């Protein structure tokens, strides 16, 4: 029904390190050598809810990585503590393109449709894998066209709400569908996550990019994510809209995300 012991900071030289990385988008065609890279395959639409079987590659998934940190280690131990992150979406300016082979405005005389519609942006930084809760708009969705997707082995009506028997951890890049996995708010004590969704059909994307913003990862007690086994975990998804082909066929478009994470040495009980 209703429901690590942190000591002092280590000071002096080499008590701080920074980790820098980017994650490329996982919209469905996730192979950097292939023509549709950075987009999904063409979206298809189920005839009925009990025949909802998306094609292989039409499904966005989370991006994720584990980064090795310098090895630190007794009655106490030292852990890396994530203090802050500077993060930005890369390639926003690529959306200033209206000459691609797309549907166009004004009786074939106007601009090509820009990438537009649904936006979904999330990132997470933690000291262990992001903990996931299963929740879907259709419990009957059949993911069997792509056995590389990680989804529950059984299906039940209750998964259109919150059924806590259906959980996971984000342990693989380009494998956990966004549409059915979300952060588990009853866990993730050692991760910070931030997300937004703007829906609708052809909604204008609203995006910003700057190298001047720092996000503090410390909690209300002044403690950041503590990196278990000297691993830092970073996850994200950045859907910026749909590309609309000549005939009306549509694909998700995603952009990469950059991270610069500041960490510090923290002594902990052992």
């Amino acid at each position: 029904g209703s429901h690590i012991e942190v000591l002092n900071l280590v000071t002096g030289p080499d008590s701080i390190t920074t980790i820098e990385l980017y994650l490329n988008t996982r919209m469905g065609q996730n192979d950097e050598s292939k023509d549709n890279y950075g987009y999904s395959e063409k979206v298809t639409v189920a005839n009925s809810s009990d025949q909802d079987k998306p094609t292989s590659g039409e499904i966005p998934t989370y991006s994720t990585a584990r980064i090795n940190l310098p090895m630190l280690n007794c009655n106490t131990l030292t852990m890396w503590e994530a203090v802050s992150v500077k993060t930005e979406v890369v390639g926003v300016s690529s959306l200033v393109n209206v000459h691609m082979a797309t549907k166009r405005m004004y009786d074939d005389k106007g601009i090509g449709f820009p990438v537009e519609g649904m936006n979904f942006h999330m990132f997470a930084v933690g000291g262990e894998p992001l903990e996931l809760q299963f929740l879907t708009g259709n419990y009957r969705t059949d993911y069997s066209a792509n056995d590389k997707l990680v989804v529950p082995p059984i299906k039940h009506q209750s998964t259109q709400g919150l059924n806590p028997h259906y959980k996971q951890k984000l342990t693989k890049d380009g494998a956990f569908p966004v549409e059915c996995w979300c952060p588990d708010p009853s866990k993730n004590e050692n991760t910070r996550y931030y997300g937004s969704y703007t829906g609708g059909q052809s909604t204008p994307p609203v995006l910003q990019f700057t190298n001047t913003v720092t996000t503090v990862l410390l909690d209300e007690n002044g403690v950041g994510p503590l990196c278990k086994g000297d691993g830092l975990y970073v996850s994200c998804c950045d859907i910026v809209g749909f590309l609309v082909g000549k005939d009306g066929d549509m694909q998700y478009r995603g952009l990469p995300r950059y991270f610069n994470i500041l960490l510090r040495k923290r002594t902990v009980r052992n």
Copy 2:
């Protein structure tokens, strides 16, 4: 309640509430949605079908029973200090392959869940106090006798008539469309709500585990839990699912709560 000193003594309570859009049985199809919306032919024959009406989610939590010294003139109560609350499953709206109407002459995406959004939560030391107010005084709720609605109707209930009140004491039973928070009461509850209307309006939603909502009032006093009960209420409508033929259903999402409480001494 005359509030005295803090006891120096803390606890947290964690829970979620599932949405009550109308199909509220977790074992059946369409859980977390309403039944198909229907439309009255006239205002004097406005009788929603059973299960097409969203209602408030709510629960009462039994807190740890505090020692009380009835021989003395003070008592200890739990005081709700703050809450971290989030809508769960927002990413589930990133789905345009469901059996829905679709864009661009049957070649484009399925329509995502879109349209009206309604988001509210409340945390208090007693049931959320409600005021009746409706868009149509004549609405007939008799297709579902489990709904809690007034026993009589009157034209004046399209505005504020203070003779029509209730308390949110049952989950999945009080229609959002005719009950709102009573701003003349709720001295011992904090509530927060928003509505964004229109037909096919983009949902705009956020989720994070980093935001704390302070529940202390202007005197530094949080909700005080009468009889060791903590009351949590919400509703989170994120839009409508548009079926192939244009039939529509409300879609709602669950809400998570993590409430911090402390012991407070009060006059008995």
Copy 3:
């Protein structure tokens, strides 16, 4: 104006006033159908034949509240007045807009939802120590209000009233009588009132509304002085249009919601 002196201290120096105002959208009789809405909107054939029907015009809501009497003697060197310090105010019944089964026009070839109340939003409130002072300004100087002689409008019309003509003023002294479309707060007066307003227009625009019991609006001015209640009267005014209800055949009515107020006042000494 009033010469403001020190605050009065002690255990009787504060009071609070709580009230609500029901909306005045046009059908303002609580015993009748369509309460809280206007009558059906009609459209002029030409600007010189612009005569709204009775009850299709929203008006301001207003009340004067009697405060506890101060000053048993009025011949004194100084007097005491109630000073409004702050207000907690909310729009009531926002959740009532979560209703798409009313007898309305509907989406997707008669299969989808009923249209929710949507379109133009207009929200304002005022708290003062005397009636809200008003300036006339209209979109059409020729508008003929004679279908309803209970509306308070100027007795003469002139072209210049489509801009600001300071010869056309009034005070908000009657509930449900001053049309919103032709009367606005007079920004050259209202020294003893605080007012706040917003407008979001367009045809079928989503209403965007909030409600909470946690927000206090401070009424003190830049000198730390709130509205001072002349004759021990507190004046509260508002209007809250949340959109239009679209009937089956396309006919439309304004929809308004009530507003709640909880006002904190304190005793202030003034020169007499």
Copy 4:
């Protein structure tokens, strides 16, 4: 460059100026029909035949206000100037946009509301101690303004004026005469003026407007110095376009609203 010294204190060291400016949308004669609107908008057949009709072009509103005389000996090493410290400004008549019964196009097969005034919004104001300095910049260098010889525009046309050509400048010295479409604030000058503006475009966009008497805008710069009023003149300028009125047959006109100002000034000593 004026060298600022100390503030002058004591009685009579502060003054206030209150005024309003009526809108200059194109029909700018308060005695005539359509005051506060433009004439109907016309559309060029080609960029080399872009000759707007007289009265279809919004212009800036502006006034020079004579301040109280600062009488003093002019031969000494200091002088006194009025310094504008802050302004409270509001758009007047926002509630007038709550009107959907005017002779307009209407919604839902001639059954619904008249279209409210909607679309493009442009709001700007400026307070300074000399005229607002202007930069010419246009969307079409060939625009022919000769239908109305009272408009102030450059005497020559050149392709480069579709960007910033610093040889094309002016000063806002006349009300209802400088078109908004081709004159903007010069950001390389205006050291002695503060200006603030916003534009929201699109075709039928909802106007989003606020009004309150509770907001003060500080005019002091980063060094604590406000506009200094040369020759005891205070310059106020604005434009407030709130959208278009859509007539029965689809003909459209700009609609503007007046703006109110309350400006606080103080005496400042300057080097002579």
Copy 5:
């Protein structure tokens, strides 16, 4: 660069003022359509995506010479100009209050001409060296050979539809680097501050502000601003305010100029 103390006293501060005109595609100030692109064209297929010359917006940029600081470049410390703050505005916003140009129009040829509307893209950067760029495109197959004055990579690969760090550049030429395929490199630009926004969609209302009252601080979290290498200050921007829709539905980008007023101070550094 090892940053030491501020230089104080008379002449320790200077200001730079400039504007940059927009580079939408027709970038010749003596010709018609200046400040706009040429007419937008649409590829028939992905492998025939070859924009016409002049239809492609590029970044504006300039390097400004600052007062010379070091007569002897072999001293054990040197002085550099440090950019502290910038006041920047988009110029000519009021020019968008124009609905009588030769455009498509509303309401069955009776209403207003369409105003410039749709996609907005706004960015500026101030730094002590050229803005560092990362290549990223919506279509690796885009053929820029209709205009060999555009600076783009000679070899393009599918991986350029995401972030491939092998594809970088520096913004060293005005009116030459297309916005559609070059963005700031977030893994570099340690000595530049950049700010950008994009609002997309088809006919979206432009939402724009202008004022002379806002100062943007360029100091980083350590209190250090961009340090001007070789006494050069680098300013870059792009301000797309939408499209002009011609009578027949043909569309062109419209851009506006941007003004900058930059305050700089003398900073000692190790040499």
